[PDB]
Amino acid sequence: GLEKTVKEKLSFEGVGIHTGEYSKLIIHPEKEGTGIRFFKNGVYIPARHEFVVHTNHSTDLGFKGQRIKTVEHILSVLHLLEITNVTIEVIGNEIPILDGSGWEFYEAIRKNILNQNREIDYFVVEEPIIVEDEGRLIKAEPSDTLEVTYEGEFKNFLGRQKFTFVEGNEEEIVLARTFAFDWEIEHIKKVGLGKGGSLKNTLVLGKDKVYNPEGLRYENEPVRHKVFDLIGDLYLLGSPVKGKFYSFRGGHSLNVKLVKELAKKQK
Amino acid sequence: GLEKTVKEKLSFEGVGIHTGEYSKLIIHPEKEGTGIRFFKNGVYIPARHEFVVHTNHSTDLGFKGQRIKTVEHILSVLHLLEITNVTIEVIGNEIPILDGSGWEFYEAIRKNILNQNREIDYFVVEEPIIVEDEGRLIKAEPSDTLEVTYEGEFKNFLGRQKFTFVEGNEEEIVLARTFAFDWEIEHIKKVGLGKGGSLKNTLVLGKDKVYNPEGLRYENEPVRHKVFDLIGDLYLLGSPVKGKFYSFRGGHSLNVKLVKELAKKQK
Ligand SMILES: CCCCCCCOc1cccc(C(=O)O)c1
Ligand SMILES: CCCCCCCOc1cccc(C(=O)O)c1
Ligand SMILES: [Cl-]
Ligand SMILES: [Zn+2]
Ligand SMILES: [Zn+2]
Ligand SMILES: [Zn+2]
Ligand SMILES: [Zn+2]
Ligand SMILES: [Zn+2]
Known part of the structure; x- marks a missing residue:
């Protein structure tokens, strides 16, 4: 299929299941070939295995002293919908857990997909x-x-x-x-x-x-x-x-x- | 000992342990011989056994269709400090549970005791x-x-x-x-x-x-x-x-x- 991004920015907020702190993410559109990356306190963290820093009770990503915990659920939903180009700005040190599933992420993102020009590799x-x-x-x-x-x-x-x-x-x-x-x-x-x-x-x-x-x-x-x-x-x-x-x-x-x-x- | 009340209004608020709802209390000073009572939606509910309506997992009172759940902790603190005359106004359906003990209630009420002109009966x-x-x-x-x-x-x-x-x-x-x-x-x-x-x-x-x-x-x-x-x-x-x-x-x-x-x- 074609690479995809979101028609408009989507945001979610709640508490991190591990930190217990307020957390919020804003998903912004990105041009073809951008890939999926998080943005926290001025640092971009690619959603890639090389940036994994913890795997006990959640999958956490880190780079240059900035870490984001529990990315597995938002990434799973993005994988299933084949969203390939977005910037996920993160407020807090973990992705909100919401009800514990990918439902809210899925329903919101599903109705805001944007086909781009470039077949997925x-x-x-x-x-x-x-x-x-x-x-x-x-x-x-x-x-x-x-x-x-x-x-x-x-x-x-x-x-x-x-x-x-x-x-x-x-x-x-x-x-x-x-x-x-x-x-x-x-x-x-x-x-x-x-x-x-x-x-x-x-x-x-x-x-x-x-x-x-x-x-x-x-x-x-x-x-x-x-x-x-x-x-x-x-x-x-x-x-x-x-x-x-x-x-x-x-x-x-x-x-x-x-x-x-x-x-x-x-x- | 002498009958007692509080020097001035005191307030507390928080989620109720059972209802899961946010509640607020306002402890009002009262004259000699008033006794201990709650106040909800225009109704006075005496802190007495005749008004108990539930005892499983908490002690709840009610009168004329108005119910207040979990009155045991605030009543215990008032009993221990010998506060005999006050009206506990409840905006909600249950006494806030706070940290689950009587500490916060005890600390505040204890610093605001007003001895009165009558020997406790x-x-x-x-x-x-x-x-x-x-x-x-x-x-x-x-x-x-x-x-x-x-x-x-x-x-x-x-x-x-x-x-x-x-x-x-x-x-x-x-x-x-x-x-x-x-x-x-x-x-x-x-x-x-x-x-x-x-x-x-x-x-x-x-x-x-x-x-x-x-x-x-x-x-x-x-x-x-x-x-x-x-x-x-x-x-x-x-x-x-x-x-x-x-x-x-x-x-x-x-x-x-x-x-x-x-x-x-x-x-
Ligand atoms: C491998 C993922 C583990 C997630 C652990 C979630 C914490 O468990 C709880 C469940 C119910 C209530 C509480 C509480 O603190 O009131 C904590
Ligand atoms: C004496 C009556 C007590 C009633 C309270 C029962 C305790 O309940 C919980 C404890 C921990 C986490 C949760 C939750 O929902 O995550 C609920
Ligand atoms: Cl029961
Ligand atoms: Zn933004
Ligand atoms: Zn462990
Ligand atoms: Zn999971
Ligand atoms: Zn029961
Ligand atoms: Zn108790």
């Missing part, structure tokens, strides 16, 4: 590749269309779940919310994170219960969310991706590791 | 009384000073703990925050409550862990808070109380039941 997976890490594993291989499957093995009532995204089913994942198990909340808060978390932006699961009064949007919302996360991290390759991926218990760390190795192979 | 427990409820038990008996002990038998790391308040040690209980076990969060939310709860106003305990990063102010903060709640519920007797109390696993429901039976015996 996709990052095409050319050969099979596999990165592993303590049971966790992610595999990628050639495909004319983006296809992402996430398989989880949970230690709670969820047990083993599996979900697969294919082009055209964007709406099956942009609603999946961020999630966390009660037994990991203590740790997250202890290490200086999750300061903005709440039942309003996070699905909290117990060994055999869902804390949120609204329950799950889908019986497999967690794995749908993981697919969403992976699509966001994959966009750090620099351009829309075309390949088939299968992630088994993967996380941001493994996702980024995969992205870096795919990049080395000069696809 | 204390509610004096005349004879021993006991109220029970499936394992839970509260005992009351004659005493020249207000003495309140609470014993908890918790199903988590807290185990069996005990705490005793005696006159003069007010500062040992006005800081103890509201608490709840993680296993009851799901329930509270599903029954339309705790809409304004968070780790900022609630101490969340697990089977053997404290979720809040700040931890506990006291190894027995929970029983201290239970003592604080009971002293608040006892003020529903209509006037400062003189008696020795022992509560084993009590809650608002059992507290109010004790108050009602004590009032019947006109003890």
